[PDB]
Design a protein around this ligand. Structure first.
Ligand SMILES: Clc1ccc(Nc2nc(-c3ccccn3)cs2)nc1
Ligand SMILES: Clc1ccc(Nc2nc(-c3ccccn3)cs2)nc1
Lengths: 193, 193
C-alpha cells in the first residue's frame, strides 16, 4: 500500500540521480519498485506525478523546518538568525539535489509544479518581509526599500544562486561558499544605509 | 539576401510576442517573411537557430552598451554608477521581452543557447568583480567577500529578478520597482560592513 508508493518514490529519486526525467520510463519505476506497470498506474497517473510528489515532500520539509525555527528562536546575533534560516534551504534542497534539479526543470512543462513552487515562494517571501518589518519596528533595521520588494529579490537570488551551485552551473558560486555569500548580501541589504 | 534574413528575424520576434516557440512553425516564419519554406532553410537550419540568432543579437546589444559605459564614465556618485550599469540590462532585455522569455526557456533544450548565456554571464561577472576590486583598491569599498563570488550572486540575482519581473511571474518585483530594488542590494552589499 503506502509501502509500494514509497518504493516508487524512492526508486524515482534514485534514478533521477543518474538521468533526467525524460530518460526514465514508467517501467523503470515499476521495475525498481518491484511492481508491474499497471500496478504503478494505480498509485500514480504518470511519472510526472511522481516527480510532483517528490518535490512536494522536499518543499514541505523545508517549510516545516522554517516553521520550527520561527517557533524556536536561537539565541544569537542578527547575522546568525538569517544564516540559520538560509541554511534550512541550503541543507534541505542540497540533500535532495536530483529532485531539486528535476523539479526546477519541470516548472516549464508542468503547471502543478509551477504552481507548487510559486505558492511556497510567496509564503517564504511573506515571512521574510514580516521579519524585516519586525526588525524595522524594533529599530534594528532602517526603513529603506519596501520590505516585500526587498524580500522578493533576496528570495529570488537564493533560488537562482543555490540551485546554480547545486547543479555546478557555469557560472556559479562554489557550494562551500554559497551560504556565506548569500548571508552577506541579506545582512548588508537588510541592515545597511 | 540579408534583407530576407532580417525579415525572418523580425517575423520571429513579432510572433514570439503572441506565442511560444513551440507554437510557431517554419511555415509561419516563411509566410511572415514572404518566402517559401525551402527558401527559409537556405537562411536557417531550424526555427531554434532563428531564436539563437535573435538572442545573440540581444545579448551582444547589452554587452556593447556595457562596453560603451566602461569607456565613458558618467560623472556621478557610486550609486549612480551601478544604477547606470544595471539599467543597460533593464532597458536592453526589457525592450525585447519576448526574445528574453523564449531565450531563457531554450536554455533547457539548446546547448548553444545555454553556452551563449553562460559565456556572457561569465563576462559580465568578471567585469562586475573587476569594478568591485577597483573600488576596494581605491579605498571606497571594504574587503569583505571574495569579489568574484559576490559578483556572481549579484549577477544571478539580476538574471532571476529582472526576468521574473518582465514575465510578470508570481512572485516578482513590479517592473517599475525592479531597478531601485536591485541597485539597493548591489550598493549595500558592495559598500557595506
Ligand atoms: Cl531556494 C530558497 C527559496 C526561498 C528562500 N527564502 C529564505 N528565507 C529565509 C528566512 C530566514 C529567516 C527569516 C525569514 N526568512 C532564509 S532563506 N531561500 C531559498
Ligand atoms: Cl540579466 C543580467 C545579467 C548580468 C547583469 N550584470 C550586471 N553588471 C552590471 C555592472 C554595472 C557596472 C559595472 C559592472 N557591472 C550591472 S548589471 N545584469 C543583469
Amino acid at each position: 500500500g503506502d509501502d509500494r508508493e514509497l518504493a516508487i518514490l524512492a526508486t524515482a529519486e534514485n534514478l533521477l540521480e543518474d538521468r533526467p526525467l525524460a530518460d526514465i520510463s514508467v517501467d523503470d519505476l515499476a521495475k525498481g519498485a518491484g511492481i508491474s506497470r499497471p500496478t504503478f498506474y494505480f498509485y500514480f497517473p504518470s511519472k510526472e506525478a511522481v516527480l510532483l510528489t517528490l518535490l512536494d515532500r522536499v518543499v514541505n520539509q523545508a517549510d516545516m523546518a522554517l516553521q520550527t525555527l520561527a517557533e524556536n528562536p536561537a539565541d544569537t546575533d542578527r547575522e546568525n538568525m538569517w544564516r540559520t534560516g538560509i541554511n534550512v534551504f541550503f541543507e534541505t534542497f542540497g540533500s535532495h539535489k536530483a529532485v531539486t534539479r528535476a523539479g526546477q526543470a519541470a516548472r516549464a512543462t508542468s503547471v502543478e509544479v509551477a504552481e507548487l513552487w510559486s505558492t511556497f515562494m510567496q509564503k517564504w517571501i511573506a515571512y521574510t518581509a514580516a521579519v524585516i518589518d519586525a526588525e524595522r519596528d524594533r529599530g534594528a533595521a532602517p526603513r529603506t526599500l519596501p520590505a516585500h520588494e526587498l524580500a522578493t529579490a533576496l528570495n529570488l537570488m537564493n533560488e537562482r544562486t543555490l540551485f546554480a551551485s547545486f547543479a555546478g552551473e557555469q557560472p556559479s558560486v562554489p557550494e562551500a561558499r554559497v551560504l556565506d555569500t548569500l548571508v552577506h548580501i541579506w545582512v548588508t541589504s537588510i541592515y545597511g544605509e
